[PDB]
Design a protein around this ligand. Structure first.
Ligand SMILES: Nc1ncnc2c1ncn2[C@@H]1O[C@H](COP(=O)(O)OP(=O)(O)O)[C@@H](O)[C@H]1O
Ligand SMILES: Nc1ncnc2c1ncn2[C@@H]1O[C@H](COP(=O)(O)OP(=O)(O)O)[C@@H](O)[C@H]1O
Ligand SMILES: Nc1ncnc2c1ncn2[C@@H]1O[C@H](COP(=O)(O)OP(=O)(O)O)[C@@H](O)[C@H]1O
Ligand SMILES: Nc1ncnc2c1ncn2[C@@H]1O[C@H](COP(=O)(O)OP(=O)(O)O)[C@@H](O)[C@H]1O
Ligand SMILES: [Mg+2]
Ligand SMILES: [Mg+2]
Ligand SMILES: [Mg+2]
Ligand SMILES: [Mg+2]
Lengths: 49, 443, 441, 433, 426
């Protein structure tokens, strides 16, 4: 109880930055990821902005 | 500099790309000389690129700092991409869990190149919006609305209960396999971006693909067969690709994989890609390694090895007798020799100037000539460090040019090896012998 | 489409009644060695003796590896051939004795063959054959079950015991998709058909064209497996939620010391199957080359194991002479092998070839590489090869041909070879470079 | 029943052919000569079958290829049957899951055994009628199997779980079936036809069965839980000595009361001419243990340094263990002995050699070793088979001899050409010029 | 029956003053060794002090290990003697020092009185959530199973008609089997029929199961509940011996102190043994040099005999018995003298009597002559061979022919050495 208190103070989410890749290949395929990446770059959320 | 690479001692030299004539030039791509050596290296590189003959060998000798590692790196650069290079030094084979022989075998297995192709099918754009008229799935047909065709698909026992599988609100782009495959979500739509303020990590929004649905997609992979060995080593052998607990791969898997690659090459599904092996300073290696390679380099899949060392008449490690080059006669027979030569003033000054350019360092005439004198009386590496230290002095001296001032300050504050040895021999009193002989007393 | 100082040595120039000729079958010369190895091959095919061994004696490029590959090719898939060097025996994971036992069990094979009847077709119907309940109770009692099937050009209905209903119940046969049932073993097995494949737009169902041939057929299988495969199948625990199997899978199992009890039980079961005629044993030739490094403990161990009953032939190769045996310097014995082994084993000698034979070797190697050289340069090629070595000329011919090709040529003439020999050096020139240059080169 | 094999070197002699007074026949039961060696083997075998003596070291020395291992294997086979006996070699002492201490401990433990007797009951007959009351998709059933012989009509019954046990596989109304009571195990004596006649006699028979198990096996089965895997995988090392003491006192009191019976075994060690002095002291401590199998040794050299030491002790063995050991030295062969050995080896190969074949075999045995002759016989027989007759004349033998090599000829060939092959300073020659 | 070179010794034979007889209970001479052993026996019987050790030095067949077995059998059953050889301390998965302390901790005996109870009865019902309604001869009580032991009960296929021997303190369950009350279920029922156990289900007993220090060390270091599934994982994750440190040593010391101060328990020392310390390396000698300087190290005995030989583990430490000089200076030497002609006679006589060999007078004297001529062991190893030879050569007694046959058949080291200098090959 005397250690785990600075958790949320200076935590940078590695999973949110996609660095847990070694644990992401269990349900990942190449073509789906490439298709999403191609249909990712803006062009869908900046228009209403 | 795609990666976090900063600079190389030889970064100006990227590629032994000899001209179409293959006749060496006095200057090319930053390198000067090595004429017959460069011609032979081009011949070797072409022979490697041939991809039809295995079991060749070339030996490199000569004093170090003559671009030997730069020579190999330029060869690799001239070989382009899709050809992984085995970066293994002499002191990397005496591993704990990997014996030297099968470690060399693993290095060769990595060194091979292969290509694989595959084909699959999917459905794209399935903005479904199921609506049926509880359970049981009576009249089990689903609306499918992509950009091109917008119809209703009839289903059966596997889908009318497969649509209730992957429970979704049916307002998103989904993928199904027309070849009797399962259902996979590729993300929601932009209209679903606004319905929930903070979308969950699972929920992502991607537009409906602009086209038809039945997509027959081909894929191509370039994976070494040793990776497949690690994959099929155990029932779930996917964690071991990066951890490194291979475990001295058995030869039964090796010959099974050889048969599989041969039959896939005959089927046309796979094709080979040449590979190279290179280890520096082969002299500091066990005689067992030389004995093993002298037999293992004539196998059917025997990529060439870039032998290189610089020692003299010594003993092969693992024996007692005097040996040529510290290498056995058997290894010094089934190969061809590359040798280097002592530096001359012109290439010394040109290489120093090129390095200064690579370091974003400006050198004037006096500093260049003085450092050429240093690099000809000593080796060029001392001058290659001195250009850096002198540019640091200059930029601390409120100028960018390097001249006699910074060079002389470096010379006074940095000691040559010969004068260092003289200082050692004349001040041995403060030094220590093997037996701990130190004169700590002063007065 | 690959070659590494090979693809030109096939067979041994053999013949019926054991005769080896001058220039035939890739090999040239070495009539004595080739006839001896042919006799060895006949002995291996005989499968009478256990654990014999023959060494080699010669210099570089005399056929040792060539003869080993020749006999390996002559064996074929029928008899396994296991090449090896003693250096691979340095197994950090497990002891040397277990490695040699595993190699021994790998060099022992068993060939299995069997034939099972197959009833194929498509289920045309399924109906009860009712009889009144004879025992306690009345009502329904199916006498038997007869079900029709039709493969391509073959239609037949199978009469079978009524119990197959459970199989129909168990396998969910539906109607006319897949049938797998035998006369005595019985029970249906299922793996629809493509005719219905278009009834659904998309599904996860299986389909197949109409079966071919007649309803009743037979299949023949031949499989040669080593006894070590059976041993490791017995040893390695495979399964699911059971704690032993999943715990073993979690533990990343290593080379556990299998007890000799299981090994002897496997040998007993293998023999009891083989004698019945359902199985038969075939040996496997273990081959180990460059054996000079092998130490004294392995020498004593092989001297002990030479007398084993199941021991297959092990052929050994080396080229040393008056040397000190590796492992320890106490035994300074010929061939790096103590006389404890030399006097108990069959020695075969080898020696390099004559100028004509070696020139034919060079020419045939050129032919396999598809390059060529005219006489006006090949004469000097032969003279230099006699002067320098065989491997020197064989390896340096390719740079000459490639240099000519890059020099807009296809033949090898005096210039290219002259400058090629001017540039590159060899072992004697390597020693000269060692003891002439004084700049650390 | 027969164990697979080929024509082995030791597949030629079985037993020793001794007498009531253990007098040695010159050539009997394969063994030829070695009269006093045969007498020593006989007195050793009577000593071990006496069972009153444990822990006596015996060592045998002699020149190379002198039938020492042949005598050893003859003694091992002469031990009869139904009694365990374990053997090891000079390089299996070391281990990783076990220490050399524990490896030798297990080697000593495996030889001794125990046999516990028990009663067994069985029902046997032919199922000629069957009637099972079983609801479809239910959880309640009964059965009546009429397992019968040709003597009487008997409809037997099944209890709660016996229905599955007697219906696991095919059971028909003609099939000869034998089941056990306490376990319900099924044993297929054979189908009646479609081929054994219906049995006679009474259905229920009683008998006795004795189970054997070695000391180390008893130590390892009950020490822990996963040791059953160690029965085959061997996933254990240095078993806790408390279990060993408990099983030892259990065996002692079992022997005292008489429930079981001891079947002491024998441990065999050969080519022990190389071994650590630590293992020698291990032998020196294990010999006087209360339970100790008789231990054999072997040697080929004489004055030599034992591993782990630096003194060239005689027989390759420290003097302490030398003194506490019984030495049985062996001498060379007689020419009569060697030619008899050649004849018996040829007839073991059942190769119908000619008289001149055995003549040249004996001449080679006089000139050089005998196993080289044991390979020259095979090569000459195959070369004669290249002529298709079942005889080997002087031609095949002479051709095989002048095509092959023994030690001395190759030694002299290398001697006169030391500069051709690799020498100790590492120079080899490829070119004939 | 079987005899292995021992069991002829049956005690030193010390009188009321600690003086042993000449030849009694398998003994011959060596009054110095016998008297020193008696002194050590009295000191151990005092059961007051600790942390002292001696070595007894003597040649081969001088009765060193014989005296060790004599003192062992003299001490008695409860007090344990720990036999160990320098080859034993070379372990595999743990360091040698920890092995030495494991031996030290298991050496000391600790009489303790802990409590065990067992539930044993016919099950009446089970209620999953756990009830196990054990019905004994006069009692029927329903315990609650914790989920782990509930799972163990489930795996035990226990149903109405079953009796289980489930211990109360450990908790593990051992089914006794199908109830003999339901013997009328099948005339050929597979399961054994065992009746309802006597007494109440929760049968309680007073037990004298003691504990060695290593026993209660492994009790908590590697719990061994046994039959329950969680106990299986506990004994499977760490089945081996773990490197117990000094912290658990102090915890264990506190636990044993409180248990022995509870009153019923008690402490008894023990004796450890080492043979041929000459082979021991300098590392273990140096470590034990600082290990005996403690308050817990119990009594150990050394048996070694070397002359001016280098101590193993070093290259220049030359000392008698192969012992480093410091250990010699801190250890007590007991002397042993070589055996004599009459001692050889009596030894062969007793070894014949124990082996049921009625060897006559002249045969015994000749065997003594061989014992005095080459070595005692050479003559001793011939008693059984000569008897068996005379049995095969139809002689109840042992004539000179039998011993001559043995001497030409079973040679000694001297004759083999005489052979070895004349041989064309080794
Ligand atoms: N022909 C050349 N052109 C430009 N730079 C060179 C040339 N030759 C050598 N150098 C410089 O000298 C250095 C040679 O080092 P290198 O020989 O690769 O070390 P090693 O001898 O350990 O392999 C390189 O850092 C490179 O910058
Ligand atoms: N007697 C031979 N006949 C044919 N080819 C040979 C012969 N000896 C060597 N070679 C060639 O040399 C290669 C093997 O060389 P090898 O004889 O094993 O060398 P070493 O004698 O040093 O072992 C083979 O690829 C083969 O093409
Ligand atoms: N008297 C004999 N009787 C039977 N076989 C013998 C005899 N002498 C030698 N042999 C054979 O010769 C080989 C020599 O081995 P052996 O004498 O047992 O041990 P070593 O080779 O150590 O002397 C044996 O394999 C055996 O088959
Ligand atoms: N005093 C004795 N009485 C009876 N037998 C003895 C006596 N001393 C030694 N022995 C016998 O001599 C043998 C050697 O004695 P032991 O003490 O075990 O080893 P060592 O004396 O060689 O160190 C033992 O087997 C023992 O039976
Ligand atoms: Mg370098
Ligand atoms: Mg080879
Ligand atoms: Mg032998
Ligand atoms: Mg003693």
């Amino acid at each position: 109880k005397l250690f785990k208190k600075n958790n949320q103070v200076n935590r940078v989410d590695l999973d949110f930055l996609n660095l847990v890749f070694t644990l992401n290949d269990k349900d990942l395929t190449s073509y789906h990821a490439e298709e999403i990446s191609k249909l990712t770059c803006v062009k869908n959320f900046v228009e209403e902005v | 500099l795609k990666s976090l690479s900063l600079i190389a001692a030889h970064s100006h030299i990227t590629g032994l790309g000899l001209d179409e004539n293959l006749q060496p030039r006095p200057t090319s791509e930053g390198m000067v000389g090595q004429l017959q050596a460069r011609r032979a290296a081009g011949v070797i590189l072409k022979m490697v690129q041939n991809g039809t003959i295995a079991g060749r060998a070339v030996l490199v000798a000569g004093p170090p700092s003559t671009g030997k590692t730069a020579l190999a790196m330029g060869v690799s650069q001239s070989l382009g991409k899709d050809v992984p290079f085995t970066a293994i030094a002499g002191s990397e084979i005496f591993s704990l869990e990997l014996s030297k022989t099968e470690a060399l075998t693993q290095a060769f297995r990595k060194s091979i190149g292969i290509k694989i192709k595959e084909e699959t099918e999917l459905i794209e754009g399935e903005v479904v919006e199921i609506q049926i008229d509880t359970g049981g799935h009576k009249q089990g047909k689903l609306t499918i609305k992509t950009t091109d065709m917008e119809t209703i698909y009839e289903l059966g026992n596997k889908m009318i209960d497969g649509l209730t599988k992957e429970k979704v609100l049916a307002g998103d782009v989904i993928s199904i396999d027309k070849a009797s495959g399962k259902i996979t979500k590729l993300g929601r739509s932009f209209a679903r971006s606004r319905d929930y303020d903070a979308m969950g990590a699972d929920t992502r929004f991607v537009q409906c693909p602009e086209g038809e649905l039945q997509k027959r997609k081909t894929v191509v992979h370039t994976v070494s067969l040793h990776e497949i060995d690690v994959i099929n080593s155990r029932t779930q052998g996917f964690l071991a690709l990066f951890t490194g607990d291979t475990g001295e791969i058995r030869s039964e898997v090796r010959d099974q994989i050889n048969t599989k690659v041969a039959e896939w090459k005959e089927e046309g599904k796979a094709e080979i890609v040449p590979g190279v092996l290179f280890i520096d300073e082969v002299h500091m290696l066990d005689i067992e390694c030389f004995s093993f390679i002298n037999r293992a380099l004539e196998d059917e899949f025997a990529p060439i090895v870039m032998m290189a060392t610089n020692r003299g008449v010594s003993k092969t490690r693992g024996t007692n007798y005097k040996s040529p080059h510290g290498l056995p006669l058997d290894l010094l027979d089934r190969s061809i020799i590359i040798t280097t030569k002592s530096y001359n003033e012109q290439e010394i000054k040109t290489i120093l100037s090129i390095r200064a350019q690579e370091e974003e360092v400006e050198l004037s005439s006096d500093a260049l000539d003085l450092l050429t004198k240093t690099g000809v009386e000593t080796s060029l590496r001392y001058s290659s460090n001195l250009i850096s230290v002198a540019q640091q002095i200059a930029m601390k001296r409120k100028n960018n040019t390097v001249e006699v001032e910074d060079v002389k300050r470096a010379y006074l504050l940095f000691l040559d090896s010969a004068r260092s040895v003289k200082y050692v021999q004349e001040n041995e009193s403060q030094y220590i012998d093997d037996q701990g002989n130190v004169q700590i007393s002063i007065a | 489409t690959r070659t590494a100082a090979h693809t030109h040595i096939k067979g041994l120039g053999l013949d019926e009644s054991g005769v080896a000729k001058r220039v035939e079958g890739g090999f040239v010369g070495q009539i004595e060695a080739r006839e001896a190895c042919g006799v060895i091959v006949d002995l291996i095919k005989a499968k009478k003796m256990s654990g014999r061994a023959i060494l080699l004696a010669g210099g570089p490029s005399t056929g040792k590896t060539a003869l080993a590959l020749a006999i390996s090719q002559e064996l074929g898939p029928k008899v396994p051939f296991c090449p090896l060097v003693g250096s691979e025996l340095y197994s950090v994971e497990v002891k040397k004795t277990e490695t040699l036992m595993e190699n021994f069990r790998r060099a022992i094979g068993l060939r299995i063959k069997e034939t099972k009847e197959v009833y194929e077709g498509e289920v045309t119907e399924l109906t009860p054959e009712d009889a009144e309940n004879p025992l306690g109770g009345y009502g329904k009692t199916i006498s038997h079950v007869i079900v029709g099937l039709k493969s391509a050009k073959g239609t037949k209905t199978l009469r079978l015991d009524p119990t197959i209903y459970e199989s129909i119940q168990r396998e969910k046969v539906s109607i006319g998709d897949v049938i797998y049932i035998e006369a005595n073993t019985g029970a249906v097995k299922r793996v629809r058909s493509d005719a219905y494949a278009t009834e659904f737009d998309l599904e996860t169902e299986e389909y197949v064209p109409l079966p071919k041939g007649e309803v009743h057929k037979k299949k023949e299988i031949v499989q040669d497996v080593t006894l070590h495969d059976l041993d490791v199948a017995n040893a390695r625990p495979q399964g699911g939620q059971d704690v032993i199997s999943m715990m073993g899978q979690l533990l990343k199992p290593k080379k556990t010391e299998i007890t000799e009890k299981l090994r002897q039980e496997v040998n007993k079961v293998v023999a009891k199957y083989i004698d019945q005629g359902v199985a038969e044993l075939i040996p496997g030739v273990l081959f180990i080359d460059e054996v000079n490094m092998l130490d004294i403990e392995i020498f004593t161990y092989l001297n002990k194991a030479l007398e084993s009953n199941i021991a297959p032939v092990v052929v050994l190769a080396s080229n040393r002479g008056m040397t000190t045996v590796r492992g320890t310097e106490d035994v300074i014995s010929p061939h790096g092998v103590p006389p404890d082994l030399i006097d108990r084993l069959l020695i075969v000698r080898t020696l390099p070839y004559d100028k004509d034979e070696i020139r034919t070797i060079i020419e045939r190697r050129a032919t396999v590489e598809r390059l060529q050289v005219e006489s006006s340069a090949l004469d000097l090629l032969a003279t230099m090869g006699t002067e320098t070595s065989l491997r020197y000329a064989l390896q340096l011919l390719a740079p000459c041909g490639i240099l000519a090709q890059t020099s807009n040529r296809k033949e090898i003439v005096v210039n290219d070879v002259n400058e090629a020999k001017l540039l590159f050096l060899d072992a004697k020139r390597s020693t000269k470079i060692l003891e002439t240059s004084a700049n650390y080169l």
